[PDB]
Amino acid sequence: LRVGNRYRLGRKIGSDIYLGTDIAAGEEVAIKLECVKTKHPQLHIESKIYKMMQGGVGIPTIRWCGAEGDYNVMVMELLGPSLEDLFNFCSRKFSLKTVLLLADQMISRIEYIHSKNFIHRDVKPDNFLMGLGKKGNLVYIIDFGLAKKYRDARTHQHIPYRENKNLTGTARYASINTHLGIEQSRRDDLESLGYVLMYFNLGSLPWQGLKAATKRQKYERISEKKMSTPIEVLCKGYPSEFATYLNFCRSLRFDDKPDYSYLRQLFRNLFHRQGFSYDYVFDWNMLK
Amino acid sequence: RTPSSAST
Numbered sequence: 001l002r003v004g005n006r007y008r009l010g011r012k013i014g015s016d017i018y019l020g021t022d023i024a025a026g027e028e029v030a031i032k033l034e035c036v037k038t039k040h041p042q043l044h045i046e047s048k049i050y051k052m053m054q055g056g057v058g059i060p061t062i063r064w065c066g067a068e069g070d071y072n073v074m075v076m077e078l079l080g081p082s083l084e085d086l087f088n089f090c091s092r093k094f095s096l097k098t099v100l101l102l103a104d105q106m107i108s109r110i111e112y113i114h115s116k117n118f119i120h121r122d123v124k125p126d127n128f129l130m131g132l133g134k135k136g137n138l139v140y141i142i143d144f145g146l147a148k149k150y151r152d153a154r155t156h157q158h159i160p161y162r163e164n165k166n167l168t169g170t171a172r173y174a175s176i177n178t179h180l181g182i183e184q185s186r187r188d189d190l191e192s193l194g195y196v197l198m199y200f201n202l203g204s205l206p207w208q209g210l211k212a213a214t215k216r217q218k219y220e221r222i223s224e225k226k227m228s229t230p231i232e233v234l235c236k237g238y239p240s241e242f243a244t245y246l247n248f249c250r251s252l253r254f255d256d257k258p259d260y261s262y263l264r265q266l267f268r269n270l271f272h273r274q275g276f277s278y279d280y281v282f283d284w285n286m287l288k
Numbered sequence: 289r290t291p292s293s294a295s296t
């Protein structure tokens with residue numbers, strides 16, 4: 001089918017997102033469709049966030065937005081596989097060098113979003129995608145469905161402290177503050193990334209596959225296990241920088257501006273002591 | 289996908 005004059009719809013690449021072509025440019029694109037009648041319209045919200053983010057390194061380009069018969073349509077830059085996909089392809093083991101390469105760009109992406117007055121609130125390996133082609137060394141961040149302003153765009157007034165807030169994003173990677181029902185802020189995006197980096201180190205987190213009767217009884221088991229696992233037990237056998245990173249995130253006050261620069265430099269100093277080069281040669285680049 | 293790993 002057509003869309004927006006110059007785009008041809010292909011088959012799904014997940015759920016919804018479809019392969020497309022920009023017929024005029026001769027370039028593959030991704031096309032997100034949302035039925036107009038859908039109960040909870042969010043595409044149009046996601047599109048306005050992507051629009052504020054444009055110009056950002058590792059933010060997908062939104063090429064076209066509009067409605068076509070029964071669907072809202074967002075046409076975007078086509079991105080490669082997620083960090084979770086690549087992790088499965090690498091037998092759920094990343095080398096220390098790959099974790100550090102990823103950590104450097106992922107902290108940068110989060111800082112960029114925060115600089116545009118948003119928190120993501122869904123930091124997980126599935127929401128970072130590698131670029132394709134000339135962008136194949138670039139980590140992108142996607143899925144701004146759960147993102148919100150943490151400060152007024154004009155005054156940079158932070159959102160107020162509030163409690164009794166329900167779990168927003170993913171149980172496995174959520175901050176302890178999120179489990180306690182505290183309003184998410186910049187610190188929580190960075191604390192989740194910390195869990196993601198130790199997930200890549202370990203192959204799983206120690207609060208994965210907890211038996212529970214319900215979804216609720218289960219978030220409660222994950223909450224308890226997380227709060228009862230010291231950062232030095234989580235990070236045992238791995239460079240201290242992973243523990244230092246998480247202790248820093250956990251020490252941040254609700255409206256604190258993180259020292260992104262300090263956190264990046266922690267990992268760069270580790271990277272340099274290991275004698276690694278920033279050559280973007282990830283583990284998956286070695287697959288024959 | 290596991291619900292512990294699902295966006296909510």
Ligand SMILES: Nc1ncnc2c1ncn2[C@@H]1O[C@H](COP(=O)(O)OP(=O)(O)CP(=O)(O)O)[C@@H](O)[C@H]1O
Nearest residue numbers: 013014015017030060076077078079080082143295
């Ligand atoms: N611009 C893009 N280029 C390539 N792949 C993309 C893409 N945008 C999204 N994807 C892929 O399409 C799938 C769905 O994307 P989306 O961000 O909407 O997931 P989602 O919000 O529905 C959570 P879930 O995947 O668990 O249902 C994901 O697997 C993602 O990797």
Ligand code: NA
Nearest residue numbers: 280281282285
């Ligand atoms: Na590469």
